[PDB]
Amino acid sequence: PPTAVTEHDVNVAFQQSAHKVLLDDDNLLPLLHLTIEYHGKEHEAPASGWAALGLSYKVQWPLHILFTPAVLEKYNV
Protein backbone atom coordinates (compact mmCIF):
# COMPACT_ATOMS: atom_id res chain seq x y z
CA PRO A 1 0.00 0.00 0.00
CA PRO A 2 1.27 3.51 -0.76
CA THR A 3 3.03 5.59 1.88
CA ALA A 4 3.77 9.29 2.14
CA VAL A 5 7.24 8.65 0.64
CA THR A 6 6.21 6.30 -2.17
CA GLU A 7 5.59 9.21 -4.55
CA HIS A 8 9.01 10.71 -3.83
CA ASP A 9 10.83 7.41 -4.22
CA VAL A 10 8.86 6.66 -7.38
CA ASN A 11 9.78 10.02 -8.90
CA VAL A 12 13.42 9.35 -8.05
CA ALA A 13 13.08 5.96 -9.72
CA PHE A 14 11.51 7.65 -12.74
CA GLN A 15 14.45 10.02 -13.06
CA GLN A 16 16.79 7.04 -12.71
CA SER A 17 14.86 5.24 -15.44
CA ALA A 18 15.16 8.26 -17.71
CA HIS A 19 18.90 8.20 -17.10
CA LYS A 20 18.99 4.44 -17.75
CA VAL A 21 17.19 5.05 -21.06
CA LEU A 22 19.30 8.12 -21.87
CA LEU A 23 16.29 10.40 -21.38
CA ASP A 24 18.49 12.79 -19.37
CA ASP A 25 18.33 15.53 -22.02
CA ASP A 26 14.53 15.92 -21.88
CA ASN A 27 13.78 19.14 -20.01
CA LEU A 28 10.36 17.51 -19.65
CA LEU A 29 11.14 14.97 -16.95
CA PRO A 30 11.52 17.85 -14.46
CA LEU A 31 8.15 19.08 -15.72
CA LEU A 32 6.61 15.64 -15.15
CA HIS A 33 6.12 14.13 -11.71
CA LEU A 34 4.30 10.93 -10.87
CA THR A 35 1.69 11.59 -8.19
CA ILE A 36 0.29 9.08 -5.70
CA GLU A 37 -3.25 9.32 -4.34
CA TYR A 38 -2.53 8.31 -0.74
CA HIS A 39 -5.11 8.65 2.01
CA GLY A 40 -2.19 8.90 4.42
CA LYS A 41 -1.47 12.31 2.92
CA GLU A 42 -3.95 13.93 5.31
CA HIS A 43 -1.55 13.66 8.27
CA GLU A 44 -8.93 4.08 1.74
CA ALA A 45 -5.18 3.95 1.20
CA PRO A 46 -4.43 2.16 -2.09
CA ALA A 47 -3.68 -1.49 -1.41
CA SER A 48 -0.72 -1.16 -3.79
CA GLY A 49 1.29 1.53 -5.48
CA TRP A 50 -0.23 0.45 -8.76
CA ALA A 51 -3.62 1.43 -7.37
CA ALA A 52 -2.08 4.62 -5.93
CA LEU A 53 -0.32 5.75 -9.12
CA GLY A 54 -1.24 9.06 -10.71
CA LEU A 55 0.30 11.36 -13.32
CA SER A 56 1.07 15.09 -13.21
CA TYR A 57 1.68 17.10 -16.40
CA LYS A 58 3.37 20.51 -16.25
CA VAL A 59 1.12 22.44 -18.63
CA GLN A 60 2.96 25.54 -19.85
CA TRP A 61 1.44 28.89 -20.73
CA PRO A 62 -0.61 29.48 -22.86
CA LEU A 63 -1.54 25.83 -23.36
CA HIS A 64 -3.31 25.80 -20.00
CA ILE A 65 -6.10 27.38 -22.04
CA LEU A 66 -6.43 23.95 -23.68
CA PHE A 67 -5.35 21.56 -20.91
CA THR A 68 -8.21 22.35 -18.56
CA PRO A 69 -8.48 20.39 -15.30
CA ALA A 70 -11.27 18.23 -16.72
CA VAL A 71 -9.01 17.28 -19.62
CA LEU A 72 -6.24 16.36 -17.21
CA GLU A 73 -8.70 14.23 -15.23
CA LYS A 74 -9.76 12.35 -18.35
CA TYR A 75 -6.09 11.92 -19.23
CA ASN A 76 -5.47 10.54 -15.74
CA VAL A 77 -8.28 8.03 -16.25
Binding site: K20, V21, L22
Partner: protein, 438 residues
Protein backbone atom coordinates in the same frame (compact mmCIF):
# COMPACT_ATOMS: atom_id res chain seq x y z
CA UNK B 1 16.23 -1.28 -16.94
CA UNK B 2 17.53 -1.80 -20.47
CA UNK B 3 17.23 -5.34 -21.81
CA UNK B 4 20.61 -5.84 -23.39
CA UNK B 5 21.19 -8.62 -25.91
CA UNK B 6 24.70 -9.90 -26.60
CA UNK B 7 25.26 -10.93 -30.21
CA UNK B 8 27.66 -13.87 -30.60
CA UNK B 9 28.97 -14.17 -34.17
CA UNK B 10 30.33 -17.68 -34.70
CA UNK B 11 32.64 -18.86 -37.48
CA UNK B 12 33.05 -17.37 -40.92
CA UNK B 13 29.33 -17.03 -41.64
CA UNK B 14 28.30 -15.91 -38.16
CA UNK B 15 31.05 -13.28 -37.93
CA UNK B 16 30.37 -11.98 -41.44
CA UNK B 17 26.64 -11.75 -40.79
CA UNK B 18 27.26 -10.02 -37.47
CA UNK B 19 29.62 -7.53 -39.12
CA UNK B 20 27.11 -6.74 -41.85
CA UNK B 21 24.33 -6.53 -39.25
CA UNK B 22 26.30 -4.01 -37.22
CA UNK B 23 27.10 -2.07 -40.40
CA UNK B 24 23.40 -1.97 -41.26
CA UNK B 25 22.53 -0.90 -37.72
CA UNK B 26 25.16 1.84 -37.88
CA UNK B 27 23.66 3.06 -41.15
CA UNK B 28 20.12 2.99 -39.72
CA UNK B 29 21.17 4.81 -36.53
CA UNK B 30 23.56 7.27 -38.18
CA UNK B 31 26.67 5.94 -36.41
CA UNK B 32 29.98 6.27 -38.23
CA UNK B 33 32.23 3.23 -38.77
CA UNK B 34 34.42 4.74 -36.04
CA UNK B 35 31.55 4.86 -33.54
CA UNK B 36 31.01 8.61 -33.89
CA UNK B 37 27.45 9.86 -34.07
CA UNK B 38 26.69 11.36 -37.47
CA UNK B 39 25.43 14.94 -37.42
CA UNK B 40 22.12 13.88 -39.03
CA UNK B 41 21.34 11.47 -36.16
CA UNK B 42 21.42 13.83 -33.16
CA UNK B 43 17.60 14.03 -33.00
CA UNK B 44 16.91 10.31 -33.41
CA UNK B 45 14.00 8.70 -31.57
CA UNK B 46 15.76 5.30 -31.44
CA UNK B 47 16.66 3.48 -28.22
CA UNK B 48 20.20 2.28 -28.91
CA UNK B 49 20.91 0.93 -25.41
CA UNK B 50 18.92 -2.26 -26.11
CA UNK B 51 21.30 -3.60 -28.79
CA UNK B 52 24.25 -1.16 -28.79
CA UNK B 53 26.27 0.12 -25.88
CA UNK B 54 26.77 3.87 -25.55
CA UNK B 55 30.24 4.97 -24.61
CA UNK B 56 30.69 7.96 -22.33
CA UNK B 57 31.67 9.97 -25.44
CA UNK B 58 28.32 9.37 -27.16
CA UNK B 59 30.07 6.62 -29.11
CA UNK B 60 27.76 3.73 -29.97
CA UNK B 61 29.55 0.39 -29.58
CA UNK B 62 27.80 -2.80 -30.77
CA UNK B 63 26.99 -5.25 -28.00
CA UNK B 64 28.58 -7.82 -30.30
CA UNK B 65 31.17 -10.51 -29.54
CA UNK B 66 32.90 -11.94 -32.62
CA UNK B 67 34.31 -15.41 -31.91
CA UNK B 68 36.43 -17.33 -34.41
CA UNK B 69 39.05 -20.03 -33.88
CA UNK B 70 40.93 -18.78 -36.97
CA UNK B 71 42.48 -15.29 -37.11
CA UNK B 72 41.56 -14.50 -40.73
CA UNK B 73 37.98 -13.38 -40.06
CA UNK B 74 38.62 -11.57 -36.78
CA UNK B 75 41.46 -9.71 -38.49
CA UNK B 76 39.12 -8.92 -41.39
CA UNK B 77 36.66 -7.34 -38.97
CA UNK B 78 39.40 -5.39 -37.20
CA UNK B 79 40.60 -4.32 -40.67
CA UNK B 80 37.19 -3.18 -41.80
CA UNK B 81 36.10 0.47 -41.68
CA UNK B 82 33.79 -0.58 -38.82
CA UNK B 83 36.63 -2.03 -36.73
CA UNK B 84 36.25 0.77 -34.17
CA UNK B 85 32.55 0.08 -33.50
CA UNK B 86 33.16 -3.02 -31.36
CA UNK B 87 34.95 -3.03 -28.04
CA UNK B 88 38.16 -4.96 -28.82
CA UNK B 89 38.38 -6.18 -25.21
CA UNK B 90 35.11 -8.12 -25.59
CA UNK B 91 36.45 -10.16 -28.54
CA UNK B 92 38.12 -13.49 -27.78
CA UNK B 93 39.67 -15.27 -30.77
CA UNK B 94 41.45 -18.61 -30.48
CA UNK B 95 45.06 -18.32 -31.63
CA UNK B 96 44.98 -22.02 -32.64
CA UNK B 97 43.82 -21.51 -36.22
CA UNK B 98 43.10 -25.22 -36.69
CA UNK B 99 39.35 -24.83 -36.12
CA UNK B 100 36.76 -27.51 -35.44
CA UNK B 101 37.11 -28.83 -38.99
CA UNK B 102 33.34 -28.63 -39.54
CA UNK B 103 32.98 -31.16 -36.69
CA UNK B 104 30.41 -30.41 -34.01
CA UNK B 105 32.30 -32.57 -31.52
CA UNK B 106 35.57 -30.76 -32.27
CA UNK B 107 33.89 -27.37 -31.91
CA UNK B 108 32.42 -28.50 -28.59
CA UNK B 109 35.80 -29.71 -27.32
CA UNK B 110 37.31 -26.39 -28.41
CA UNK B 111 34.59 -24.51 -26.54
CA UNK B 112 35.53 -26.59 -23.51
CA UNK B 113 39.21 -25.76 -24.04
CA UNK B 114 38.54 -22.01 -24.32
CA UNK B 115 35.71 -22.07 -21.76
CA UNK B 116 37.38 -19.75 -19.26
CA UNK B 117 38.31 -17.08 -21.82
CA UNK B 118 34.82 -17.13 -23.34
CA UNK B 119 32.88 -17.15 -20.09
CA UNK B 120 35.15 -14.44 -18.67
CA UNK B 121 34.32 -12.29 -21.69
CA UNK B 122 30.62 -13.08 -21.46
CA UNK B 123 30.54 -12.30 -17.74
CA UNK B 124 32.41 -9.02 -18.21
CA UNK B 125 29.89 -7.97 -20.85
CA UNK B 126 26.97 -9.16 -18.71
CA UNK B 127 28.20 -7.12 -15.77
CA UNK B 128 28.44 -4.22 -18.18
CA UNK B 129 24.71 -4.70 -18.88
CA UNK B 130 22.20 -3.15 -16.49
CA UNK B 131 19.53 -5.77 -17.28
CA UNK B 132 21.02 -8.15 -19.86
CA UNK B 133 18.08 -10.05 -21.30
CA UNK B 134 20.04 -12.76 -23.09
CA UNK B 135 22.34 -13.80 -25.88
CA UNK B 136 21.56 -14.05 -29.58
CA UNK B 137 23.93 -16.46 -31.30
CA UNK B 138 24.34 -15.98 -35.04
CA UNK B 139 25.85 -19.24 -36.21
CA UNK B 140 25.31 -22.20 -38.50
CA UNK B 141 24.38 -25.58 -37.04
CA UNK B 142 26.34 -27.25 -39.84
CA UNK B 143 29.66 -25.41 -39.60
CA UNK B 144 32.42 -26.11 -37.14
CA UNK B 145 32.44 -23.07 -34.90
CA UNK B 146 28.73 -22.32 -35.00
CA UNK B 147 27.86 -26.00 -34.67
CA UNK B 148 30.47 -27.48 -32.36
CA UNK B 149 31.58 -24.36 -30.55
CA UNK B 150 27.97 -23.21 -30.67
CA UNK B 151 26.82 -26.35 -28.85
CA UNK B 152 29.62 -25.96 -26.31
CA UNK B 153 28.63 -22.35 -25.75
CA UNK B 154 24.97 -23.36 -25.50
CA UNK B 155 25.86 -25.79 -22.71
CA UNK B 156 28.07 -23.30 -20.89
CA UNK B 157 25.54 -20.48 -21.27
CA UNK B 158 22.80 -22.77 -19.98
CA UNK B 159 24.91 -23.42 -16.90
CA UNK B 160 26.19 -19.85 -16.37
CA UNK B 161 23.10 -17.75 -17.26
CA UNK B 162 20.12 -19.92 -16.29
CA UNK B 163 17.91 -16.80 -16.11
CA UNK B 164 18.92 -15.28 -19.49
CA UNK B 165 17.20 -15.95 -22.81
CA UNK B 166 19.07 -17.89 -25.51
CA UNK B 167 17.99 -16.92 -29.02
CA UNK B 168 19.79 -18.25 -32.08
CA UNK B 169 19.92 -17.06 -35.65
CA UNK B 170 20.82 -20.47 -37.04
CA UNK B 171 21.80 -20.44 -40.71
CA UNK B 172 20.83 -23.70 -42.33
CA UNK B 173 23.13 -24.93 -45.09
CA UNK B 174 22.00 -25.39 -48.66
CA UNK B 175 20.26 -28.77 -48.85
CA UNK B 176 20.30 -29.00 -52.65
CA UNK B 177 24.08 -29.07 -53.18
CA UNK B 178 26.33 -31.94 -52.11
CA UNK B 179 28.06 -30.66 -48.98
CA UNK B 180 31.82 -31.12 -49.16
CA UNK B 181 31.46 -32.02 -45.46
CA UNK B 182 29.86 -35.47 -45.50
CA UNK B 183 29.42 -35.24 -41.72
CA UNK B 184 27.66 -31.88 -41.90
CA UNK B 185 24.34 -33.62 -41.14
CA UNK B 186 25.91 -35.10 -38.01
CA UNK B 187 27.18 -31.70 -36.88
CA UNK B 188 23.76 -30.21 -37.60
CA UNK B 189 21.96 -32.94 -35.66
CA UNK B 190 24.26 -32.47 -32.66
CA UNK B 191 23.62 -28.73 -32.80
CA UNK B 192 19.88 -29.31 -33.08
CA UNK B 193 20.13 -31.58 -30.02
CA UNK B 194 21.83 -28.80 -28.09
CA UNK B 195 19.24 -26.29 -29.31
CA UNK B 196 16.54 -28.72 -28.18
CA UNK B 197 17.95 -29.14 -24.69
CA UNK B 198 19.71 -25.84 -23.95
CA UNK B 199 18.29 -23.17 -26.31
CA UNK B 200 15.11 -21.13 -25.89
CA UNK B 201 14.59 -20.11 -29.54
CA UNK B 202 16.06 -21.16 -32.92
CA UNK B 203 15.37 -18.92 -35.93
CA UNK B 204 16.00 -21.09 -39.00
CA UNK B 205 17.74 -19.24 -41.87
CA UNK B 206 17.91 -21.69 -44.79
CA UNK B 207 20.74 -20.84 -47.18
CA UNK B 208 19.18 -23.14 -49.79
CA UNK B 209 16.02 -21.04 -49.73
CA UNK B 210 18.07 -17.85 -49.75
CA UNK B 211 19.89 -19.00 -52.90
CA UNK B 212 16.58 -20.02 -54.47
CA UNK B 213 15.15 -16.59 -53.63
CA UNK B 214 18.19 -14.80 -55.04
CA UNK B 215 17.83 -16.68 -58.32
CA UNK B 216 14.03 -16.70 -58.70
CA UNK B 217 13.09 -13.31 -57.19
CA UNK B 218 16.29 -11.26 -57.18
CA UNK B 219 17.34 -12.73 -60.54
CA UNK B 220 20.78 -13.31 -59.04
CA UNK B 221 22.60 -15.91 -61.11
CA UNK B 222 24.78 -17.72 -58.58
CA UNK B 223 24.00 -15.54 -55.54
CA UNK B 224 27.12 -14.56 -53.64
CA UNK B 225 27.45 -14.85 -49.89
CA UNK B 226 27.62 -11.05 -49.81
CA UNK B 227 24.15 -10.73 -51.34
CA UNK B 228 22.79 -13.43 -49.05
CA UNK B 229 24.28 -11.62 -46.06
CA UNK B 230 22.74 -8.36 -47.30
CA UNK B 231 19.34 -10.06 -47.26
CA UNK B 232 20.13 -11.47 -43.82
CA UNK B 233 21.09 -8.02 -42.56
CA UNK B 234 17.81 -6.68 -43.93
CA UNK B 235 16.01 -9.42 -41.99
CA UNK B 236 17.95 -8.68 -38.80
CA UNK B 237 17.10 -4.99 -39.18
CA UNK B 238 13.45 -5.88 -39.54
CA UNK B 239 13.72 -8.04 -36.42
CA UNK B 240 15.30 -5.14 -34.55
CA UNK B 241 12.92 -2.50 -35.89
CA UNK B 242 10.73 -2.62 -32.78
CA UNK B 243 13.91 -2.09 -30.76
CA UNK B 244 15.16 0.73 -32.97
CA UNK B 245 11.91 2.73 -33.11
CA UNK B 246 10.33 3.34 -29.69
CA UNK B 247 6.68 2.32 -29.77
CA UNK B 248 3.79 1.94 -27.36
CA UNK B 249 3.52 -1.86 -27.35
CA UNK B 250 5.73 -4.93 -27.54
CA UNK B 251 8.81 -2.92 -26.63
CA UNK B 252 10.56 -6.01 -25.22
CA UNK B 253 11.74 -9.37 -26.50
CA UNK B 254 9.77 -11.30 -23.86
CA UNK B 255 6.45 -10.31 -25.42
CA UNK B 256 7.69 -11.16 -28.91
CA UNK B 257 8.87 -14.62 -27.89
CA UNK B 258 5.74 -15.40 -25.90
CA UNK B 259 3.69 -14.37 -28.94
CA UNK B 260 5.76 -16.46 -31.37
CA UNK B 261 6.67 -19.68 -29.51
CA UNK B 262 3.67 -21.16 -27.65
CA UNK B 263 5.37 -24.58 -27.38
CA UNK B 264 8.82 -24.55 -25.76
CA UNK B 265 9.99 -27.52 -27.81
CA UNK B 266 8.22 -26.03 -30.84
CA UNK B 267 10.59 -23.08 -30.88
CA UNK B 268 11.51 -23.09 -34.58
CA UNK B 269 10.21 -19.84 -36.10
CA UNK B 270 9.73 -19.25 -39.82
CA UNK B 271 10.53 -15.82 -41.24
CA UNK B 272 9.01 -13.76 -44.01
CA UNK B 273 10.29 -10.43 -45.33
CA UNK B 274 8.87 -7.73 -47.52
CA UNK B 275 9.63 -6.27 -49.91
CA UNK B 276 12.09 -8.90 -51.20
CA UNK B 277 12.73 -7.37 -54.61
CA UNK B 278 15.66 -6.23 -56.69
CA UNK B 279 15.69 -2.53 -57.50
CA UNK B 280 0.12 0.08 -51.59
CA UNK B 281 -2.47 -0.76 -48.95
CA UNK B 282 -1.85 -2.68 -45.75
CA UNK B 283 -4.00 -5.44 -47.23
CA UNK B 284 -1.96 -5.50 -50.44
CA UNK B 285 1.26 -5.63 -48.42
CA UNK B 286 0.00 -8.49 -46.27
CA UNK B 287 -1.27 -10.35 -49.34
CA UNK B 288 2.11 -10.08 -51.04
CA UNK B 289 3.84 -11.28 -47.89
CA UNK B 290 1.27 -14.09 -47.80
CA UNK B 291 2.20 -15.19 -51.29
CA UNK B 292 4.12 -18.49 -50.98
CA UNK B 293 6.59 -17.41 -53.69
CA UNK B 294 7.81 -14.72 -51.27
CA UNK B 295 8.55 -16.91 -48.23
CA UNK B 296 12.31 -17.03 -47.61
CA UNK B 297 12.36 -20.46 -45.93
CA UNK B 298 12.19 -23.76 -47.81
CA UNK B 299 9.59 -25.69 -45.84
CA UNK B 300 7.94 -28.48 -47.75
CA UNK B 301 4.32 -27.86 -48.70
CA UNK B 302 3.33 -31.43 -48.02
CA UNK B 303 -0.17 -31.85 -49.41
CA UNK B 304 -0.55 -35.06 -47.40
CA UNK B 305 0.32 -33.39 -44.11
CA UNK B 306 -1.96 -30.42 -43.57
CA UNK B 307 0.79 -28.09 -42.52
CA UNK B 308 -0.56 -24.89 -41.03
CA UNK B 309 0.56 -21.57 -39.72
CA UNK B 310 0.82 -21.63 -35.95
CA UNK B 311 1.23 -17.86 -35.71
CA UNK B 312 2.01 -14.89 -37.95
CA UNK B 313 3.26 -11.46 -36.91
CA UNK B 314 3.58 -8.84 -39.63
CA UNK B 315 5.78 -5.92 -38.62
CA UNK B 316 4.93 -3.16 -41.09
CA UNK B 317 7.33 -0.21 -41.09
CA UNK B 318 6.38 3.17 -42.56
CA UNK B 319 3.33 5.39 -43.03
CA UNK B 320 0.44 2.96 -42.53
CA UNK B 321 -3.19 3.92 -42.04
CA UNK B 322 -4.48 1.86 -39.09
CA UNK B 323 -7.95 1.87 -40.63
CA UNK B 324 -6.42 0.18 -43.64
CA UNK B 325 -4.77 -2.26 -41.27
CA UNK B 326 -8.14 -3.15 -39.75
CA UNK B 327 -9.72 -3.50 -43.18
CA UNK B 328 -6.79 -5.65 -44.32
CA UNK B 329 -7.16 -7.99 -41.36
CA UNK B 330 -10.87 -8.24 -42.09
CA UNK B 331 -10.26 -9.04 -45.76
CA UNK B 332 -7.57 -11.62 -44.94
CA UNK B 333 -9.86 -13.37 -42.47
CA UNK B 334 -12.79 -13.35 -44.87
CA UNK B 335 -10.57 -14.73 -47.65
CA UNK B 336 -9.06 -17.43 -45.41
CA UNK B 337 -5.75 -16.67 -47.10
CA UNK B 338 -3.88 -18.43 -44.27
CA UNK B 339 -4.45 -21.76 -42.56
CA UNK B 340 -3.85 -21.59 -38.81
CA UNK B 341 -2.96 -24.25 -36.25
CA UNK B 342 -6.07 -26.25 -35.26
CA UNK B 343 -5.06 -26.85 -31.63
CA UNK B 344 -4.86 -23.20 -30.60
CA UNK B 345 -6.25 -19.82 -31.58
CA UNK B 346 -4.86 -18.23 -34.73
CA UNK B 347 -2.29 -15.71 -33.54
CA UNK B 348 -2.14 -13.07 -36.28
CA UNK B 349 -0.53 -9.84 -35.10
CA UNK B 350 0.17 -6.64 -37.02
CA UNK B 351 2.66 -4.13 -35.62
CA UNK B 352 2.86 -0.63 -37.08
CA UNK B 353 6.30 0.93 -36.72
CA UNK B 354 8.16 3.99 -37.93
CA UNK B 355 11.25 3.69 -40.08
CA UNK B 356 14.67 4.76 -38.86
CA UNK B 357 15.18 8.46 -39.71
CA UNK B 358 18.84 7.80 -40.55
CA UNK B 359 18.34 5.18 -43.25
CA UNK B 360 17.08 6.27 -46.70
CA UNK B 361 14.15 3.99 -47.58
CA UNK B 362 13.18 3.80 -51.25
CA UNK B 363 9.97 2.06 -50.10
CA UNK B 364 7.44 4.06 -48.11
CA UNK B 365 6.39 0.78 -46.47
CA UNK B 366 8.27 -2.44 -45.78
CA UNK B 367 7.07 -5.55 -43.98
CA UNK B 368 8.51 -8.54 -42.17
CA UNK B 369 6.48 -11.67 -41.51
CA UNK B 370 7.47 -13.98 -38.67
CA UNK B 371 5.51 -17.22 -38.94
CA UNK B 372 5.37 -20.44 -36.94
CA UNK B 373 4.10 -22.86 -39.60
CA UNK B 374 3.91 -26.64 -39.44
CA UNK B 375 5.56 -27.14 -42.83
CA UNK B 376 8.88 -26.62 -41.03
CA UNK B 377 8.38 -30.22 -40.00
CA UNK B 378 9.17 -31.04 -43.62
CA UNK B 379 12.56 -29.39 -43.05
CA UNK B 380 13.12 -31.36 -39.86
CA UNK B 381 12.09 -34.57 -41.61
CA UNK B 382 14.53 -33.79 -44.43
CA UNK B 383 17.31 -33.21 -41.89
CA UNK B 384 16.50 -36.48 -40.12
CA UNK B 385 16.48 -38.34 -43.44
CA UNK B 386 19.85 -36.85 -44.37
CA UNK B 387 21.28 -37.89 -41.00
CA UNK B 388 19.92 -41.42 -41.40
CA UNK B 389 21.31 -41.52 -44.95
CA UNK B 390 24.78 -40.66 -43.71
CA UNK B 391 24.71 -42.89 -40.62
CA UNK B 392 23.49 -45.88 -42.64
CA UNK B 393 26.77 -45.94 -44.60
CA UNK B 394 29.12 -45.47 -41.61
CA UNK B 395 31.00 -43.14 -43.95
CA UNK B 396 33.99 -41.14 -42.70
CA UNK B 397 33.50 -42.43 -39.15
CA UNK B 398 37.18 -43.21 -38.57
CA UNK B 399 37.82 -39.51 -37.95
CA UNK B 400 34.75 -39.26 -35.72
CA UNK B 401 36.04 -42.14 -33.62
CA UNK B 402 39.14 -39.98 -33.20
CA UNK B 403 36.96 -37.35 -31.50
CA UNK B 404 35.89 -37.80 -27.90
CA UNK B 405 32.16 -37.35 -28.56
CA UNK B 406 32.30 -40.20 -31.10
CA UNK B 407 35.39 -42.06 -29.90
CA UNK B 408 33.48 -44.81 -28.09
CA UNK B 409 30.08 -44.84 -29.80
CA UNK B 410 27.59 -42.77 -31.79
CA UNK B 411 24.97 -42.68 -29.03
CA UNK B 412 24.90 -38.89 -29.25
CA UNK B 413 24.01 -39.31 -32.93
CA UNK B 414 21.30 -41.82 -32.06
CA UNK B 415 19.91 -39.50 -29.39
CA UNK B 416 19.96 -36.68 -31.94
CA UNK B 417 18.01 -38.89 -34.35
CA UNK B 418 15.54 -39.61 -31.56
CA UNK B 419 15.20 -35.91 -30.70
CA UNK B 420 14.60 -35.05 -34.36
CA UNK B 421 12.02 -37.83 -34.51
CA UNK B 422 10.29 -36.39 -31.44
CA UNK B 423 10.35 -32.96 -33.09
CA UNK B 424 8.79 -34.36 -36.26
CA UNK B 425 6.17 -36.21 -34.20
CA UNK B 426 5.33 -33.08 -32.22
CA UNK B 427 4.93 -31.17 -35.49
CA UNK B 428 2.58 -33.91 -36.67
CA UNK B 429 0.60 -33.75 -33.43
CA UNK B 430 0.40 -30.00 -33.92
CA UNK B 431 -0.97 -30.92 -37.34
CA UNK B 432 -3.81 -32.79 -35.63
CA UNK B 433 -6.92 -31.37 -33.96
CA UNK B 434 -5.91 -33.11 -30.71
CA UNK B 435 -2.61 -31.20 -30.50
CA UNK B 436 -4.08 -29.00 -27.77
CA UNK B 437 -4.68 -32.25 -25.89
CA UNK B 438 -1.60 -33.99 -27.33
Amino acid sequence: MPREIITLQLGQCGNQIGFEFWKQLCAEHGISPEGIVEEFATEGTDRKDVFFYQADDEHYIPRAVLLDLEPRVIHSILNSPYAKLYNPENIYLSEHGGGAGNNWASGFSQGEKIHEDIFDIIDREADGSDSLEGFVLCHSIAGGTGSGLGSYLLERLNDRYPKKLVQTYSVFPNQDEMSDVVVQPYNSLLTLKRLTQNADCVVVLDNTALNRIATDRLHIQNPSFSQINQLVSTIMSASTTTLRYPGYMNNDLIGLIASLIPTPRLHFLMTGYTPLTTDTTVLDVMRRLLQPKNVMVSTGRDRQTNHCYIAILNIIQGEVDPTQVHKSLQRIRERKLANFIPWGPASIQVALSRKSPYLPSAHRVSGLMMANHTSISSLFESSCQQYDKLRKREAFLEQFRKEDIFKENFDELDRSREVVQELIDEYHAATRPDYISW
